[PDB]
Symmetry: C2
């Protein structure tokens, strides 16, 4: 129920963020480029990352209003990563619509991603903050940007091989999703506080939430009911996607199981999909990943303890808790 | 001969620029990503853009040394555009080597371009300049970045059609190549001078040189001797590339000629290539573009008149003059 109100707040902030986003990427020449760029932002994303920005600036000092363009920067960066990643992953349809590359082609999709990335920094420039703050915000966003490319690169290398280790996958996801999430919180703080203890606490919360997010999604993809998930379980198995669940299984399973799993991994199909999920349960792999996600969530909030009590800290605690309780 | 010394200077500055470039993109994890990113920079580009930066800061105030990272930013941006553009243009081999996408694949090439773009801004952040200057440099680079994507987008749309107008092609090239060149000079000034008259003069010189560069290359591609060009003339004709020469021809040629040119445009071949170049000469199209390039060169230098006499202004005048006299 409170989640309903939390989403009420989240959706409330989204409005401010959205006006800024679309004033940066309006319908102008060239349109094909700007509509291609506008496609994902227009899908009506919930703007969780920007929300973490503005909400983080309130858990430390106040006036998230000054963290609007920097929050926009982060949402623009997130969107550009989706466009390019969809090209690489060969993703057919984001949301209930075709992906940017399928509609406008790979070349225009690359350019749209580029435009989106470029405008994240134009958003960073438009920020209204002290030179020292600005300089420190630009540098947080840049380092997260680099980690993001590095995490996606390691993710591409995985394709060159059948198995991965828990350590390999965690180093990859940390930069793919964790980095930008951490940057969201860390940038929120910086904009409203000079308390290095808060920032270190906000950063740790973003890092952990960003990672647990994805891990929980991978978990849901296997054991979430189809009807509700809108689709059958195990599409990540059919995809041969490297998740923490699959890494745990490869680390713990005997040769016989490993080899059978690999036959029916990333290759009627109802039987093979289930036989694969059964192989994973045999070794507690799904449950394992579920626990890791919950622990990171606990550690994240238990790190916000350091900040004062406000409804802003409240939302950050609720969000983190929601991100791991949902189906 | 003086060109030999100019290139001696250019190559002299390249050293400083190169150390900074490779400290930003060193051989680190992940390597496949960082070598893919290092591939074009390692080709030993002459760093003309960065040279314009440091040289421009000397034509106004002095101490180009403080314009090193901002110059690096621009060279990193130029390099990322080459990687992505090569993917789009289906370019087989830059220089005497394979392109990034052919060696590492399209996905890793996209990521390499992304990393290169991200590190341009990490270079911008590392700059050692007053907050006001920094903020104004970041904003010049961002707007040129946006123009660059816009110019490349319009260039992609051209493929959707057989003919283009002189106006269409100039609006496209202006952002593709002109913008970044203008930014190179404009950013040089800003770093060393608060004279808005210099900056407007430097900017105008960069814009014009950047555009004339490309126009002269297209001219050479047709009428430059093969032996010397290292290859036969008219590969742009076989490519069906939209240049100012082709735009002038489509604007001036009669229907009969238009239609024949289109048959043998972007499609033994020695005869068709020559028949196409002959069609262009009939209407003065090649000569036309040559003159436009020379005029822009004259206008560019005649705009540097405003700055004091130094050897820095000297090099900027020589470079502009070289860019249009070479073969
Ligand atoms: Br399990
Ligand atoms: Br001619
Ligand atoms: Hg990336
Ligand atoms: Hg671009």
């Amino acid at each position: 129920e409170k989640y309903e109100e939390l989403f009420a707040r989240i959706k409330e902030k989204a409005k401010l963020i959205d006006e800024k986003i679309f004033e940066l990427i309006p319908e102008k020449d060239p349109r094909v480029l700007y509509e291609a760029a506008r496609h994902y932002p227009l899908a009506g994303g919930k703007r969780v990352r920007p929300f973490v920005v503005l909400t983080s600036t309130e858990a430390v000092g106040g006036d998230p209003l000054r963290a609007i363009y920097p929050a926009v920067a982060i949402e623009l960066i997130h969107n550009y990563s989706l466009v390019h990643d969809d090209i690489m992953d060969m993703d057919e349809t984001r949301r209930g619509k075709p992906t940017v590359h399928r509609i406008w082609g790979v070349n225009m999709a690359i350019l749209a991603g580029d435009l989106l990335f470029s405008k994240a920094f134009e958003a960073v420039a438009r920020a209204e903050i002290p030179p020292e703050k600005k300089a420190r915000v630009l540098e947080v966003i840049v380092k997260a940007s680099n980690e993001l490319c590095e995490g996606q690169a390691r993710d591409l290398e995985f394709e060159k091989k059948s198995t991965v280790t828990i350590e390999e996958y965690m180093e990859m996801i940390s930069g793919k999703t964790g980095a930008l999430f951490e940057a969201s919180a860390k940038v929120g703080g910086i904009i409203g506080t000079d308390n290095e203890e808060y920032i270190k606490a906000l950063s740790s919360w973003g890092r952990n939430v960003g990672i647990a997010f994805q891990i929980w999604d991978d978990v849901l993809d296997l054991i979430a009911d189809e009807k509700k998930l809108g689709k059958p379980v195990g599409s990540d198995i059919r995809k041969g996607k490297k998740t923490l669940i699959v890494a745990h299984f490869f680390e713990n399973a005997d040769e016989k199981d490993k080899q059978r799993f690999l036959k029916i991994f990333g290759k009627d199909i109802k039987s093979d999909v289930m036989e694969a999920i059964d192989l994973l349960k045999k070794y507690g792999s799904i449950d394992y990943a579920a626990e890791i996600a919950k622990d990171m969530i606990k550690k994240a909030n238990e790190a916000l303890r350091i900040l004062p009590k406000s409804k802003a800290r409240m939302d950050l605690e609720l969000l983190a808790k929601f991100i791991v309780e949902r189906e």
